[PDB]
Design a protein around this ligand. Structure first.
Ligand SMILES: NC(=O)c1ccc[n+]([C@@H]2O[C@H](COP(=O)([O-])OP(=O)(O)OC[C@H]3O[C@@H](n4cnc5c(N)ncnc54)[C@H](OP(=O)(O)O)[C@@H]3O)[C@@H](O)[C@H]2O)c1
Ligand SMILES: NC(=O)c1ccc[n+]([C@@H]2O[C@H](COP(=O)([O-])OP(=O)(O)OC[C@H]3O[C@@H](n4cnc5c(N)ncnc54)[C@H](OP(=O)(O)O)[C@@H]3O)[C@@H](O)[C@H]2O)c1
Ligand SMILES: NC(=O)c1ccc[n+]([C@@H]2O[C@H](COP(=O)([O-])OP(=O)(O)OC[C@H]3O[C@@H](n4cnc5c(N)ncnc54)[C@H](OP(=O)(O)O)[C@@H]3O)[C@@H](O)[C@H]2O)c1
Ligand SMILES: NC(=O)c1ccc[n+]([C@@H]2O[C@H](COP(=O)([O-])OP(=O)(O)OC[C@H]3O[C@@H](n4cnc5c(N)ncnc54)[C@H](OP(=O)(O)O)[C@@H]3O)[C@@H](O)[C@H]2O)c1
Ligand SMILES: NC(=O)c1ccc[n+]([C@@H]2O[C@H](COP(=O)([O-])OP(=O)(O)OC[C@H]3O[C@@H](n4cnc5c(N)ncnc54)[C@H](OP(=O)(O)O)[C@@H]3O)[C@@H](O)[C@H]2O)c1
Ligand SMILES: NC(=O)c1ccc[n+]([C@@H]2O[C@H](COP(=O)([O-])OP(=O)(O)OC[C@H]3O[C@@H](n4cnc5c(N)ncnc54)[C@H](OP(=O)(O)O)[C@@H]3O)[C@@H](O)[C@H]2O)c1
Lengths: 166, 168, 166, 168, 167, 167
């Protein structure tokens, strides 16, 4: 009955995002997780495709004890009109009641559309910038990710990709 | 890890689709399920949104004891260029090895891109199809019996029947 | 304070549409008039451009005693996602309270978004099909339109266009 | 019938734009006013929607005794191809004879398409510009005095100040 | 320098299109050839991609001794606004003076933009048309005889007959 | 038949690009030349339209005795998804075997799709580059000497220098 929504680039999905997700799941029955900027891939800032991130999330949420009945994973391309983005999200998702975001634009867009909006319950070393930097510089990127996500990154040759792009 | 792909409108997701899915899951480790024509909603032929169909699939696959580790559910908008549609799918999905489709165009597009392609292991009859489901929703027939219960619950929540009747 | 919305192709704007508009203006303070399928032009069914129809409406509503403070005229291209069309309209228009339409799809889309929806107060010989047929067959198309709209059609060579296209 | 064209973001519509418009109306019979970058809203640089700006213009031009027969107000989304933007404008507008712009790109695009192009008859200073208006909305300065009253009423109704402050 | 323009789907490029092109080249210095509906491929009506048709035209025009200095080959996707299509063409092509088309819509769109418009100098019969070519590809008829040999070679390389049969 | 691919903005087409093209033509039977960022025109960085650049390439390659049977010229608009760009190119071009690029992104995108990728055989200096050409157009320098004469003629016809100065 009570459904939350979370949106992030997740480039890549790391232990931080997972902690936040589990924390949100203590307050809602179900969580809709949107992969934002689904159109961006193959850059230093945004290395992975939508599909690759769907894979990461799907595998990570399965490998941790979260029942499938409690979440949805949805890629969302950015669009040119901010005034349409909430409609875009709504079309691509189940009905939802509350939005979790610390981003002022996301907050205000959802808020103007009449949604309840609140900051994530947790703020997280576990950041995507650090993960990507470590992938580039042969640091310990693996320890920042769930093992299921490292397996995705090995399969898709994520490290080699990001190094070539740099 | 052997990964299949299936693509369909699923307007709505019915017991036929589910039967096909379970059959495919006997021959692959994981199945990527794409919801095609994700852009189309609010017509007699295509009543439900991408999001509504994501919900239907997610609930149905969960209610039937298929482990979450064995599937992916991905909305896919149609595009103008057929020659690009396979690239579009690939961008939106995990890597995959084999495509299941009875549709000649889908087959040929994937085959030209070097994918293994086969027909679905099962073919369901017209009486269990989306057309029959939608017709029964319109005419007060027994649409519920053609769907998994978890999907009927989605349709009740979103007022699907009222929608389709108004649109007609 | 109370604002209505009306949407139509208006190919072209005829006396019928004007009658409906004046009738709606007895029930609302302001009327937002959307020119639908703004992208379609240069066919038998849809001969005129968005701009040409903006012109027709702007001139017709000015030539009749309707104060400028009581209406807005807005071209609206169709989009691929029905579930986004109401958001599309909202982005392009002032805030509004009630929608006037006899079209089941328009009704249901607006209704699902929480808007009050009602049929036009008047139903109208004055139809666009008749107007276009008369333009093609040298009938009396002029008598079906406000004079300000006929002047637009003369300036843009509307009759010659539609005849060449046929 | 001599018809001018003007194009601007008008984020928001201020007394400067209005002054320019009235000056242009001394030398043309009718003025087509295009709201550029109609797609951009909900940023510090571009806070208001196309619709909100249509409202602002419609109300402001009405409140200043400019007859409705003398202008057109048209939202125009930007497009990726500069070489097509003039065609895009032409499709969305009545026929026109002369373009008023101080912007080199706008000038050149219209000039290459064979239109007469001239600079606006008036140039307003920075202190009356959209940047100053938005800055004052953010910093609790006197933004109201830079706008026609009809535009301030739009901004109150849509909670423009609260929006821009939250976005910052 | 007098420059003509021609626009067609060319699904595929056949001897008829070539005949028309050569006739136009008697009356202009250079001919801009646009491949219309460049977005459509992999249907019975529109089997070949933009790229495949570029290949067909490029090969056919080179095999028939038409100097390269006399033509341009340009893929053009359809767009949703008819009132923008001429601007779309203009952006994608060299400057041009005259448009060759028998199609009322194409004629009127170009004409409203101030271009001189005229019908093609030659009309080929249905028996030599793309519809006949495609039908023969499907039904194992003599499709090859309706195409320049360079185009047949393209169709063999890209497995065009196998494609259209599967579809 | 061994077919190479090259992709560049070519704003405008200069002697450097031509030198590279001729070097590539020693190693392949045919070269597909894509005009990238075909959507961008009327800026200081990207002054010329797709059509104008098609004209430049078509004229330059014909003026230098490269037979028409050895190349294809294809405008290619950028797209928002990098993961789709190779599919976009493939749709718009003949089949090809090898990609020539020094750009890491272009290399990796093509490489991930299974194409052989190699750097161009020749690198020209900054002094002969598009940036230098455009700068000289702006500052009344000797831009003409950096271009094939056929390209200069295009630029005169389309009033390219006047455009870039106004911008
Ligand atoms: N018109 C449109 O298309 C439109 C409009 C609005 C938003 N969007 C999209 O919506 C998405 C969401 O916006 P966003 O700004 O939140 O995306 P984002 O790129 O994920 O930005 C969030 C930033 O804050 C960090 N962060 C997020 N949650 C955190 C937490 N609980 N604790 C600590 N740090 C946290 C992230 O770190 P990590 O990188 O490590 O995760 C990231 O650096 C974006 O893709 C944006 O493009 C699109
Ligand atoms: N360029 C592009 O964007 C592009 C190109 C190719 C395909 N696509 C998209 O790909 C999606 C799938 O294509 P499609 O042709 O398969 O469309 P579809 O809408 O999924 O329809 C296929 C038809 O076959 C039926 N069917 C499917 N599997 C069956 C089975 N095992 N036994 C019996 N009947 C079965 C479906 O029945 P039900 O009515 O019961 O579902 C439906 O009637 C569509 O959204 C299509 O638009 C897009
Ligand atoms: N996803 C999308 O983009 C989307 C979704 C929904 C709707 N739309 C668009 O929204 C627009 C509105 O839909 P619509 O079906 O109402 O458009 P429409 O094409 O104007 O259809 C209305 C039809 O009913 C007639 N009519 C309208 N009001 C009447 C009245 N009061 N009395 C008698 N007859 C009347 C019209 O006659 P006349 O021709 O003489 O005016 C016309 O034949 C369309 O352009 C449609 O494409 C778009
Ligand atoms: N390809 C495309 O889609 C394309 C191509 C060309 C142009 N456009 C669009 O066309 C629109 C207009 O272009 P623009 O360069 O004029 O943008 P703009 O946003 O209207 O800005 C022009 C700048 O000049 C100021 N200004 C305008 N008229 C003035 C006057 N009379 N005196 C003093 N200052 C004046 C404006 O001030 P204020 O801040 O006070 O308004 C603004 O700071 C924009 O939306 C642009 O994006 C689009
Ligand atoms: N808004 C837009 O995007 C827009 C607007 C207008 C036109 N267009 C596009 O422009 C392109 C051209 O339009 P079109 O109407 O000419 O389409 P087309 O499909 O290229 O030609 C129409 C028919 O005429 C035949 N034909 C052409 N030249 C002939 C000749 N000289 N003698 C005998 N038959 C001849 C063709 O034969 P074959 O079958 O043998 O080829 C075809 O059957 C199309 O791709 C269309 O989609 C786009
Ligand atoms: N998602 C997408 O749409 C996508 C993805 C990747 C790439 N692209 C497009 O693909 C095109 C090509 O990419 P690019 O990075 O190669 O861009 P580019 O702008 O064509 O070239 C980049 C720079 O390298 C220079 N250069 C090229 N070849 C050279 C050589 N042999 N020797 C010396 N300098 C040389 C160019 O010189 P000049 O200035 O003299 O030309 C230019 O300054 C672009 O249009 C890009 O936008 C698009």
């Amino acid at each position: 009955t009570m459904r939350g929504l979370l949106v992030g680039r997740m480039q890549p999905f790391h232990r931080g995002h997972l902690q936040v997700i589990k924390s949100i799941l203590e307050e809602v029955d179900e969580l809709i997780i949107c992969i934002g900027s689904a159109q961006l891939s193959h850059s230093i800032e945004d290395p992975f495709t939508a599909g690759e991130r769907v894979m990461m999330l799907t595998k990570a949420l399965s490998e941790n004890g979260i029942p499938a009945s409690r979440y949805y994973i949805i890629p969302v391309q950015d669009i040119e009109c901010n005034a349409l983005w909430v409609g875009h999200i709504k079309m691509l998702t189940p009905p939802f009641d509350r939005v979790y975001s610390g981003n002022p634009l996301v907050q205000r867009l959802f808020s103007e559309d009449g949604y309840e909006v609140t900051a994530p319950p947790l703020f997280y070393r576990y950041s995507g910038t650090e993960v990507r930097r470590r992938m580039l510089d042969d640091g310990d990127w693996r320890s920042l990710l769930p093992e299921s996500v490292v397996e995705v990154i090995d399969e898709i040759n994520g490290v080699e990709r990001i190094k070539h792009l740099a």
